[PDB]
Amino acid sequence: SPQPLEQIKLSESQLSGRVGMIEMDLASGRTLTAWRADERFPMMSTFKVVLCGAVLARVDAGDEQLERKIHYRQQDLVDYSPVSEKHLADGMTVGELCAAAITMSDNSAANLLLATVGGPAGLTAFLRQIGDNVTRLDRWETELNEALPGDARDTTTPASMAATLRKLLTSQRLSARSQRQLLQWMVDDRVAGPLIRSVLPAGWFIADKTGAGERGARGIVALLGPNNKAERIVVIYLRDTPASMAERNQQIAGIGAALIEHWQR
């Protein structure tokens, strides 16, 4: 595989789309690779990690409990609710909803949690409170995945997302237990995680949240590193490409391969 930046360029050429990427040291925030890092990209499902960070902040403040059971109705469900559609009779705890949203990409679980933090406006205010003045959520699932060209709604930038993930996982803004919980939810991805692990060389740590949208939108926020350690945050977003989902997955994997083969930088 070629050098990271060269592979990223090759992906834009082959996809006819825009790629946004940041590779950052998790412990210190040192930026290693940055491509279109300040350009906007739809967050898609990756917003769910920030959402659960806002939920954990409420738990830390005593305004929420992960144990609290929420009962909802069938009319509250939106498209793709693999876990939440199974609990119309018994409900789900707040903690279970975050696990469903992050590890199973459950859209209704995400909307139920979004309401608890004040909706899109409330989550955006949370972002502003932790110092992210760029990322914004404006809609609910599943409209937030629309990815209209030039639409600033429901977007982030690679640099803003990486910094925000770092703040939530390591800056001590969240309690130790909350930081550990957010990390574990990413480690527990039941969809993309297992497949990625199957193709990663032995010894590489992976935790992640992936997302997809219209007009070729595709992305992943991940923790990756050799020696079975979460050494770096890697954020990759793709937008405005007419390519098949398989090809978008392949290009993202190719950028990861370039990072793995040229890790010491």
Ligand X SMILES: *C(=O)c1cc2ccccn2c1N[C@@H](C(=O)O)[C@](C)(COC(=O)Cc1ccc(O)c(O)c1)S(=O)O
Ligand Y SMILES: OC[C@H]1O[C@H](O[C@H]2[C@H](O)[C@@H](O)[C@H](OCCCCCCC3CCCCC3)O[C@@H]2CO)[C@H](O)[C@@H](O)[C@@H]1O
Chain residues binding ligand X by CB under 6 A are 44-45, 105, 145, 191-192, 195, 210-213, 249
* Shortest Cβ 230–ligand X spacing (Å): 20
- With CB under 5 to 8 Å by kind, the binding choice for 261 among ligand Y, ligand X, none is ligand Y
Binding ligand Y (rule: CB under 6 A), the pick from 224, 233, 238, 243 is 224
Which one of the listed residues 6, 67, 85, 143 is annotated catalytic? 143
* Shortest Cβ 107–ligand X spacing (Å): 8
Which one of the listed residues 11, 23, 45, 84 is annotated catalytic? 45
Tell me if 105 is assigned to a ligand binding site.
yes
Three-state DSSP at 208 gives: strand
* Pairing status of strand 155-156 against strand 205-212: unpaired
Q: Is 55:98 a contact under the CB 8 Å cutoff? A: yes
* Pairing status of strand 18-25 against strand 205-212: unpaired
Tell me if 175 is assigned to a ligand binding site.
no
Three-state DSSP at 34 gives: strand
Q: Which two tokens stand for residue 122?
A: 């409330």
Query: Active site includes 28?
Result: no
By CB under 6 A, residue 256 contacts ligand Y: yes
Rounded CA gap, 125 and 217, in Å? 25
Three-state DSSP at 155 gives: strand
Rounded CA gap, 236 and 13, in Å? 16
- Nearest residue to the partner ligand Y, using Cβ: 256
Transcribe 133-145 into DSSP letters.
Answer: SS-B----TTGGG
**59 or 99: CB nearest ligand X:** 99
Rounded CA gap, 168 and 154, in Å? 19
By CB under 6 A, residue 3 contacts ligand Y: no
**88 or 187: CB nearest ligand Y:** 187
Tell me if 81 is assigned to a ligand binding site.
no
By CB under 6 A, residue 261 contacts ligand Y: yes
By CB under 6 A, residue 191 contacts ligand Y: no
Q: Is 6:223 a contact under the CB 8 Å cutoff? A: no
Rounded CA gap, 137 and 121, in Å? 7
* Shortest Cβ 44–ligand X spacing (Å): 5
Query: Active site includes 45?
Result: yes
Residues of the binding site:
48, 105, 141
Q: Catalytic residue positions?
A: 45, 143
Binding site for ligand Y (CB under 6 A): 1, 196, 199-201, 208, 220, 222, 224, 234, 236, 252-253, 256-257, 260-261
